[PDB]
Design a protein around this nucleic acid. Structure first.
Ligand SMILES: COC(=O)C[C@](O)(CCCC(C)(C)O)C(=O)O[C@@H]1C(OC)=C[C@]23CCCN2CCc2cc4c(cc2[C@H]13)OCO4
Ligand SMILES: [Cl-]
Ligand SMILES: [Cl-]
Ligand SMILES: [Cl-]
Ligand SMILES: [Cl-]
Ligand SMILES: [K+]
Ligand SMILES: [Mg+2]
Ligand SMILES: [Mg+2]
Ligand SMILES: [Mg+2]
Ligand SMILES: [Mg+2]
Ligand SMILES: [Mg+2]
Ligand SMILES: [Mg+2]
Ligand SMILES: [Mg+2]
Ligand SMILES: [Mg+2]
Ligand SMILES: [Mg+2]
Ligand SMILES: [Mg+2]
Ligand SMILES: [Mg+2]
Ligand SMILES: [Mg+2]
Ligand SMILES: [Mg+2]
Ligand SMILES: [Mg+2]
Ligand SMILES: [Mg+2]
Ligand SMILES: [Mg+2]
Ligand SMILES: [Mg+2]
Ligand SMILES: [Mg+2]
Ligand SMILES: [Mg+2]
Ligand SMILES: [Mg+2]
Ligand SMILES: [Mg+2]
Ligand SMILES: [Mg+2]
Ligand SMILES: [Mg+2]
Ligand SMILES: [Mg+2]
Ligand SMILES: [Mg+2]
Ligand SMILES: [Mg+2]
Ligand SMILES: [Mg+2]
Ligand SMILES: [Mg+2]
Ligand SMILES: [Mg+2]
Ligand SMILES: [Mg+2]
Ligand SMILES: [Mg+2]
Ligand SMILES: [Mg+2]
Ligand SMILES: [Mg+2]
Ligand SMILES: [Mg+2]
Ligand SMILES: [Mg+2]
Ligand SMILES: [Mg+2]
Ligand SMILES: [Mg+2]
Ligand SMILES: [Mg+2]
Ligand SMILES: [Mg+2]
Ligand SMILES: [Mg+2]
Ligand SMILES: [Mg+2]
Ligand SMILES: [Mg+2]
Ligand SMILES: [Mg+2]
Ligand SMILES: [Mg+2]
Ligand SMILES: [Mg+2]
Ligand SMILES: [Mg+2]
Ligand SMILES: [Mg+2]
Ligand SMILES: [Mg+2]
Ligand SMILES: [Mg+2]
Ligand SMILES: [Mg+2]
Ligand SMILES: [Mg+2]
Ligand code: NA
Ligand code: NA
Ligand code: NA
Ligand code: NA
Ligand code: NA
Ligand code: NA
Ligand code: NA
Ligand code: NA
Ligand code: NA
Ligand code: NA
Ligand code: NA
Ligand code: NA
Ligand code: NA
Ligand code: NA
Ligand code: NA
Ligand code: NA
Ligand code: NA
Ligand code: NA
Ligand code: NA
Ligand code: NA
Ligand code: NA
Ligand code: NA
Ligand code: NA
Ligand SMILES: [Sr+2]
Ligand SMILES: [Sr+2]
Ligand SMILES: [Sr+2]
Ligand SMILES: [Sr+2]
Ligand SMILES: [Sr+2]
Ligand SMILES: [Sr+2]
Ligand SMILES: [Sr+2]
Ligand SMILES: [Sr+2]
Ligand SMILES: [Sr+2]
Ligand SMILES: [Sr+2]
Ligand SMILES: [Sr+2]
Ligand SMILES: [Sr+2]
Ligand SMILES: [Sr+2]
Ligand SMILES: [Sr+2]
Ligand SMILES: [Sr+2]
Ligand SMILES: [Sr+2]
Ligand SMILES: [Sr+2]
Ligand SMILES: [Sr+2]
Ligand SMILES: [Sr+2]
Ligand SMILES: [Sr+2]
Ligand SMILES: [Sr+2]
Ligand SMILES: [Sr+2]
Ligand SMILES: [Sr+2]
Ligand SMILES: [Sr+2]
Ligand SMILES: [Sr+2]
Ligand SMILES: [Sr+2]
Ligand SMILES: [Sr+2]
Ligand SMILES: [Sr+2]
Ligand SMILES: [Sr+2]
Ligand SMILES: [Sr+2]
Ligand SMILES: [Sr+2]
Ligand SMILES: [Sr+2]
Ligand SMILES: [Sr+2]
Ligand SMILES: [Sr+2]
Ligand SMILES: [Sr+2]
Ligand SMILES: [Sr+2]
Ligand SMILES: [Sr+2]
Ligand SMILES: [Sr+2]
Ligand SMILES: [Sr+2]
Ligand SMILES: [Sr+2]
Ligand SMILES: [Sr+2]
Ligand SMILES: [Sr+2]
Ligand SMILES: [Sr+2]
Ligand SMILES: [Sr+2]
Ligand SMILES: [Sr+2]
Ligand SMILES: [Sr+2]
Ligand SMILES: [Sr+2]
Ligand SMILES: [Sr+2]
Ligand SMILES: [Sr+2]
Ligand SMILES: [Sr+2]
Ligand SMILES: [Sr+2]
Ligand SMILES: [Sr+2]
Ligand SMILES: [Sr+2]
Length: 237
RNA sequence: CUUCAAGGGCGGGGAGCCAUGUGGACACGACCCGAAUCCGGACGAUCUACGCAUGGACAAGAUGAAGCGUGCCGAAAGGCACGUGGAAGUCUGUUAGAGUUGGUGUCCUACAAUACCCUCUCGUGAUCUAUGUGUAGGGGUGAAAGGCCCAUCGAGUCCGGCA
RNA sequence: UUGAGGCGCCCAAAAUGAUCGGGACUCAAAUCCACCACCGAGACCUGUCCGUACCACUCAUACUGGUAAUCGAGUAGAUUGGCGCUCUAAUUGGAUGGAAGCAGGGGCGAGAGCUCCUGUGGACCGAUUAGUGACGAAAAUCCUGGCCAUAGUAGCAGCGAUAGUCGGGUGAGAACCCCGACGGCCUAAUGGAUAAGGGUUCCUCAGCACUGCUGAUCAGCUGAGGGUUAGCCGGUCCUAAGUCUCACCGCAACUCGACUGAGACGAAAUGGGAAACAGGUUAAUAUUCCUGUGCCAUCAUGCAGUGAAAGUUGACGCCCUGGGGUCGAUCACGCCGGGCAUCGCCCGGUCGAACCGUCCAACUCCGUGGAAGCCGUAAUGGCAGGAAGCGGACGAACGGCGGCAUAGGGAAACGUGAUUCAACCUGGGGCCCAUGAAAAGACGAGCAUGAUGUCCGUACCGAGAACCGACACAGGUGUCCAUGGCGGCGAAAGCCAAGGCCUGUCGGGAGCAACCAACGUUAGGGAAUUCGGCAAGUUAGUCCCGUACCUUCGGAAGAAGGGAUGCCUGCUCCGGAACGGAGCAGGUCGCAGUGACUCGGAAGCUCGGACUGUCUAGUAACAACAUAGGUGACCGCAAAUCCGCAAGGACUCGUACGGUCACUGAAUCCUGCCCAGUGCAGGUAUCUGAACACCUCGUACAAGAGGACGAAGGACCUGUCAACGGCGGGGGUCUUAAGGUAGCGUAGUACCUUGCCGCAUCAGUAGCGGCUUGCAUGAAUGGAUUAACCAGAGCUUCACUGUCCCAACGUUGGGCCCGGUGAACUGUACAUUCCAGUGCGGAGUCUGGAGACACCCAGGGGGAAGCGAAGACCCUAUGGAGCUUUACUGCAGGCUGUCGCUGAGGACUCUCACUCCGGGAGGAGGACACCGAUAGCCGGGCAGUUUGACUGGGGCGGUACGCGCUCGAAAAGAUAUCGAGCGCGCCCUAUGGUCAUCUCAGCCGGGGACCCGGCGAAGAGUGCAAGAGCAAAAGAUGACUUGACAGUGUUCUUCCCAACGAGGAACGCUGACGCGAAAGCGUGGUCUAGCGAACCAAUUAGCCUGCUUGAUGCGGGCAAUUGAUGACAGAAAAGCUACCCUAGGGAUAACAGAGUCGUCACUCGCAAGAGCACAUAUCGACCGAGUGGCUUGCUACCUCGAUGUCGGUUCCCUCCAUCCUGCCCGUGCAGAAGCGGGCAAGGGUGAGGUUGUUCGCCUAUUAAAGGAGGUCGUGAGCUGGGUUUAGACCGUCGUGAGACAGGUCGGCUGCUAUCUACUGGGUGUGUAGGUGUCUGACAAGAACGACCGUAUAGUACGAGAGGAACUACGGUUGGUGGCCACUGGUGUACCGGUUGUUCGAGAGAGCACGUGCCGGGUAGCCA
């Protein structure tokens, strides 16, 4: 047959690539040595084309104009502090050890000094729970208990732009516009609507899948379609 | 040679070797032409598909969302009337432009290897379009028709394998 | 009276024209019995010759003689002698006193071929012998070239751009080259400027051989010259998506490859960007040259300045909108010029840049001020955190103003104000799950003078002739002019300027016929047409009134329906005003006032998909795809998913409100039961589970055998269906888990089926509602439902109409004739055919007849199974390809163990490799992971293949695919079919072998066990089919025994004849045995079925052998046994294709023809039976005999290098088995009306509703509304609804691709007529200069068919009811021929009205598609 759509994806052609040249900033945490004497004023609130949520333009004490991942309730004029001895206020970045338990946090690092990996999408947050000399247990937006190094930096507050998922797209045109700003080929043609040559579920006199949809983990690319290694399917039971 | 034995098999009382012509066999293109393949290396996104960059295009009219206003009523929440406002993959539209339903009309050694006419659809948007740019052959591209990738596609084209 | 024979008669119906081959024949030219004489082959006889064979003579196969009654045809094929071509060689010749070749002619040879003569030609050419070979053509849809017919034919018409005409000029020549006039065409283009692309096409001169749809003096053609001028227009410079180079790394390697660095490249209309304007000039350039004026950058000098880099700019989305404002357009008035001349109106002009200077609205801000309700807007809005007002800072135009300018330009005047205002300037608002470039550069940052400003592009076209499309192609191809006038909402129509053009480039002629393309108008009827209103038409602009069901409250909706609409006079209202808008009163014209143009037909029910959107470039626009919405799955990021061999990469400037992978498909109400199978996932005592290492055996080592341990995986258990899917049969459970819940339901799913009832219609296989047992509905394989939307499928109503009844007339372009230009398709030959026949069964050519003087013109297409295409259907090939899967075999990939990297102290700690994070310090992880290697599991993701044969085509079924018997089988042997009957793939240690003893079925008689006797050739028994064999046995009993033995043959069979293996049998020998007294019997079972190659393994006994040699291990071999290939003389092996492809086949199916005639239709014989009695008025069984060739079936003869499929239509002919009509017979015939039958094919046999239908059902009419044949007549006539391509849906089936003799929506119709045929028209020839009139052999007709009514007559008849006829009349209908006084149509003759626009008004005209529209309409032509 012919390579399926998921295989054409990896080749990284124009149709599948993100419009990186139209993107603003790689929202990472600032590099401080030790001292905390790094603070800044918020100059503007901009729209980030990569995440459909707002991003705050901050100017630091040493004269560095950088775009930071904006939490909720951060405006122009507000002072934000980045460092170890930083104030426990919304919009400030300090390591998980210094942040008190039961406080909603965002833009959490995986390995200390990476710049933030977890809890970055609109309105989400990570919950800091347990403290130790060795480990800081953070509850990620999926409900998972992630055991992290207490030296991993994070910004206090929930991410801005909450409730985005609440309003429906209503029409295909609105989806079109959102998708033109992402690294995704859209619209989606069902495999069941294709020819046998194009997809494992293609073919037939009527539209139905060939074999069952739940595919093994060990399945090769070109066959791994439908429900990938499903523990279960359906709603009931 | 096989063989207690017996019986079988093959060979035996000197004709061959070489040359030339010719009959026939086998491998090779194998009397000659005749077809759909398969494989290799190359050349194509001047057509077309999808994406991207930078530009361009859309007479006129209709309908009248929110919001705002004034007035009346109400304790209030609000409600009603009128106006304002000018939303919309909104409507009419041969505006430009795009498309192509029917005539199974005209043409069918054509004007034309996909044309002509009338009719018909869309026309502020998932819109149309120029140029630049990207993706390449079991690979692209595909709102999926096995569509499209230069009159070539259920695996392009060229040459080679190859007689 | 009865029997028999001969010939004939009845029985006896078919489609273009009858037949014995024809004519025709009757005491025969028939038939039968005899007879006589003839004709008639290549046979037979005979003369001569030839070949071949043999004989004699001979060296001879050279002569000569002889023999053939017992030699003389031949495809495939075998054998043999010879002819011709090229060049070589030897020998030997010819030729300028004329070689070869060619043309015509003479002679020889059976022939291949040889040779001569004459003419031409003008330099080479032979013979014999031996060689050599790119050596012989009628053919291959053969190749290349040339050429004829086709043919003076098609095209040079068709397009909303119908274009020309009269004079004249030039010239050898003029319809189309030029001038004028008149008449037209183009208005987002047919005008103006350009991008690409072209490349000299540009200008001039000279030309016409080429090219130009005719011609040409012209030209984009031919030839020669000439032509493109830049500091300030582009390029150049900058950076965009992105590209390349180098370095690095990978790769076997590179011209290959991702990342990361650095560098460069990447924008000519249309991104950014230092600077130019006005005029003049050329045959051709021009912001480039020239004149005038101006501007920018750099550098130099001088003055100023020490500021200098922060900041600003470059620099930005979509929608709405205010303000400023120029060109343009228009209005007012004035000046200059022109036009018109009943008025006094109409047109043109009235100019003047860059630049320099200056002005500033908006925005923002400052001071003042002090609003508690005011300020403000088109709108939002603003404010004690300070509103209005006042003053001020900053600050715009491509704009105003002044200079520029006693510059330029104009014949002249050489204006002034205004409105609406593109450009340009500047603000306010709204939207985003969408956030709308970058860099160079500039500003910031003065002035003078001077210098420098190079390089590249620059012509022309930019398209119905300069580009792409082979073309001077009706196609395709980007940008700017979007503000010219009237018109109107308008960048709409229509008309007209500026500008362009008569080159969408052949003309002339005929009231100009048929026929065709586009089109106008048609009385009465009004969808009767058709699958279907396809096509056409209707409606229409604007205002007022008014507006249903339903609904998601948005909508439906312009629902529907009704009214109005012009001009003129005078006005009112809104607004600053418009040359803006809304109204009022009076007057007034037409058939018509959106007067043309522009411009919706409307309503209802049902199906589908929610909607906008997408798609098969080129037969599918749809119900298919997408969509929001719903849902499930995977993943915490060193992730999930995906790309790469690797180095590496996408997702990702991303992080679960994410994004990957799938399903469903808006909303609303909902979404039942099932985890048995399959899938996925989790778990797992126990079981199974590879390699490494480890242990045992083995080997001085090794191979090898075994054990222990045991990962993932599997077994097993569990979870899961919005996972694949399933939701039945039986009874008052069974399979296999459950057993169909809401709903919906004859469905796009229902076979039966046109289901039943209802609605609607005269009539409704349709449609809608209800019912509904559902062949075979049903819940995200989503069920139901649904407002809105739709070039989607079906149905109904109103309106409308040439779709129809039923056709007519007209208009334009063709067609026809003439000048010019000038193809192609097609061609074995012959060809004037027709009716029959025959033939490979579908003949212009054969046979028999008939007809036929030749040639030409026009026509519509009957035939040439017409032309076009090596059939796409079907089968076949040990063909191809795409696709599928639990086909065969493999390959990636994932998971998992093990080894290496890899280190220290059956679980654990550490840090030093290694990995990751961190800029770094350092942090996390860590001997793991990554990577290299190997092992097990999964593994259509990918690759290569296979998937047999037989067969009344193929498939399905079956196996006549290996064996045995009877019959078929025709009395030797052999013998086929999917022939008839039926078996074998073993079984038996005795059921084998021998010997002894003995005789069985069945029956009878005496005491179904047992006993005695008798009869009893065989019917018993003998393992199993069938046929056969057997009685002191081959059977039974008993006893003994293992010959069912080893070895090796002969022969037959397998395979008749007649080659072929395994297998089998008969018959021997050698050895050893058993039994018997012995002869003898035993090579399994009485005979014929019970069977298997090579390779490899195991096994039996002895021996041979392994690379210098000895020992040991382990191998190689001779002989044979066992293990299976049943497709049985042996491959290891599944499907789909409608996406298809190739080779072929009429070796083979579908349609049609042909044969047959069971079937079908029709008839006949007999006549049981009933018909109150009565066979025969009428009906009529059984049985028997036939005819036809409409149905069906059978066959496989014809065609697969194609004979176009159903139904319908249109037009022609025919048959009779007659439905009506005419004439008859019978009657259970009173009459009337019927029933049945006979002759008879002249004429007729019609309109409609459902359905694609044929068929059929139904309605109303009718004299009747018959059937059938003509390739199921008729696609070079039509239609295209059905069948039967490619798209899609539903049901059923399938794991799946996909399938269906199921349903459903969509889905293409080629060609210029050579021959023949006919309809009409001519020219010639024959009869044999003329005019006029006739004759009539033949030929055609349907020229007529039928009905109603009145008188007869309320009569005959009949109780009555009821109710005729002859005849004479009147009319109607169908058909036919002709004609136009009458009625009607047309009438782009003509006359009138009138809308828009242009010619100034008037008058009078053009255009609005070949009449703008409306009204009337003569002649003619018509019904
Ligand atoms: C299955 O039906 C078809 O395949 C029709 C067609 O394909 C038509 C071809 C038309 C062309 C292309 C030749 O013009 C065809 O070749 O038909 C053959 C054909 O083509 C010449 C003619 C045949 C041959 C016998 C006569 N018959 C007439 C037409 C026909 C009709 C059929 C038929 C076969 C024939 C053949 O099956 C049933 O319907
Ligand atoms: Cl999304
Ligand atoms: Cl001879
Ligand atoms: Cl230029
Ligand atoms: Cl404003
Ligand atoms: K055929
Ligand atoms: Mg970031
Ligand atoms: Mg995109
Ligand atoms: Mg989809
Ligand atoms: Mg499909
Ligand atoms: Mg398909
Ligand atoms: Mg597949
Ligand atoms: Mg479906
Ligand atoms: Mg489905
Ligand atoms: Mg292109
Ligand atoms: Mg309003
Ligand atoms: Mg000689
Ligand atoms: Mg030759
Ligand atoms: Mg031949
Ligand atoms: Mg002709
Ligand atoms: Mg004209
Ligand atoms: Mg000239
Ligand atoms: Mg032309
Ligand atoms: Mg009429
Ligand atoms: Mg009809
Ligand atoms: Mg129509
Ligand atoms: Mg006023
Ligand atoms: Mg229906
Ligand atoms: Mg749709
Ligand atoms: Mg198409
Ligand atoms: Mg469509
Ligand atoms: Mg979805
Ligand atoms: Mg769908
Ligand atoms: Mg019904
Ligand atoms: Mg369910
Ligand atoms: Mg063929
Ligand atoms: Mg086929
Ligand atoms: Mg194949
Ligand atoms: Mg790293
Ligand atoms: Mg495969
Ligand atoms: Mg076969
Ligand atoms: Mg015999
Ligand atoms: Mg084998
Ligand atoms: Mg063995
Ligand atoms: Mg065999
Ligand atoms: Mg055999
Ligand atoms: Mg074929
Ligand atoms: Mg045949
Ligand atoms: Mg034909
Ligand atoms: Mg008769
Ligand atoms: Mg007749
Ligand atoms: Mg027919
Ligand atoms: Mg025909
Ligand atoms: Mg045809
Ligand atoms: Mg034709
Ligand atoms: Mg149909
Ligand atoms: Mg159909
Ligand atoms: Na092949
Ligand atoms: Na392209
Ligand atoms: Na409102
Ligand atoms: Na069209
Ligand atoms: Na549409
Ligand atoms: Na390919
Ligand atoms: Na022969
Ligand atoms: Na001309
Ligand atoms: Na100025
Ligand atoms: Na639309
Ligand atoms: Na199950
Ligand atoms: Na079902
Ligand atoms: Na008409
Ligand atoms: Na014809
Ligand atoms: Na294929
Ligand atoms: Na096979
Ligand atoms: Na034998
Ligand atoms: Na018969
Ligand atoms: Na027909
Ligand atoms: Na008759
Ligand atoms: Na036919
Ligand atoms: Na046709
Ligand atoms: Na037909
Ligand atoms: Sr980083
Ligand atoms: Sr990051
Ligand atoms: Sr499928
Ligand atoms: Sr459930
Ligand atoms: Sr391109
Ligand atoms: Sr508009
Ligand atoms: Sr619209
Ligand atoms: Sr059509
Ligand atoms: Sr035409
Ligand atoms: Sr065509
Ligand atoms: Sr038409
Ligand atoms: Sr529209
Ligand atoms: Sr080749
Ligand atoms: Sr002979
Ligand atoms: Sr002979
Ligand atoms: Sr030859
Ligand atoms: Sr010719
Ligand atoms: Sr013309
Ligand atoms: Sr131009
Ligand atoms: Sr000439
Ligand atoms: Sr010229
Ligand atoms: Sr450049
Ligand atoms: Sr530019
Ligand atoms: Sr204005
Ligand atoms: Sr054009
Ligand atoms: Sr076109
Ligand atoms: Sr003009
Ligand atoms: Sr011409
Ligand atoms: Sr008229
Ligand atoms: Sr109708
Ligand atoms: Sr009808
Ligand atoms: Sr009306
Ligand atoms: Sr729904
Ligand atoms: Sr299960
Ligand atoms: Sr039920
Ligand atoms: Sr003709
Ligand atoms: Sr073909
Ligand atoms: Sr058959
Ligand atoms: Sr025997
Ligand atoms: Sr199968
Ligand atoms: Sr299909
Ligand atoms: Sr008769
Ligand atoms: Sr009669
Ligand atoms: Sr029929
Ligand atoms: Sr029927
Ligand atoms: Sr007929
Ligand atoms: Sr049917
Ligand atoms: Sr069917
Ligand atoms: Sr059709
Ligand atoms: Sr004569
Ligand atoms: Sr009467
Ligand atoms: Sr009476
Ligand atoms: Sr006219």
């Amino acid at each position: 047959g012919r390579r399926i759509q998921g295989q054409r994806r990896g080749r990284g052609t124009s149709t599948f690539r993100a419009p990186s040249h139209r993107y603003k900033a790689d929202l990472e945490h600032r590099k401080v040595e030790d001292g905390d004497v790094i603070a800044g004023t918020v100059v503007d609130i901009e729209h980030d084309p990569a995440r459909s949520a707002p991003v705050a333009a901050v100017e630091f004490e040493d004269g560095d104009r950088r775009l930071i991942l904006a939490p909720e309730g951060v405006g122009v004029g507000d002072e934000l502090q980045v460092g170890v001895s930083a104030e426990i206020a919304p919009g400030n970045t300090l390591p998980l050890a210094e942040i008190p338990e039961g406080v909603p946090v965002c833009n959490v690092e995986s390995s200390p000094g990476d710049g933030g990996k977890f809890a970055r999408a609109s309105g989400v947050n990570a919950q800091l729970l347990t403290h130790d000399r060795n480990v800081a247990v953070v509850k990620l937006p999926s409900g998972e208990m992630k055991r992290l190094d207490p030296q991993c930096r994070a910004t206090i507050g929930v991410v801005a732009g909450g409730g985005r998922t609440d309003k429906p797209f209503v029409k295909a045109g609105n989806k079109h516009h959102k998708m033109k700003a992402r690294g995704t080929k859209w619209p989606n043609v069902r495999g069941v609507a294709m020819n046998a040559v194009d997809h494992p579920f293609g073919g037939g006199g009527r539209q139905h899948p060939g074999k069952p949809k739940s595919i093994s983990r060990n399945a090769p690319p070109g066959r791994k379609v439908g429900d990938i290694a499903s523990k279960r399917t359906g709603r009931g039971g």
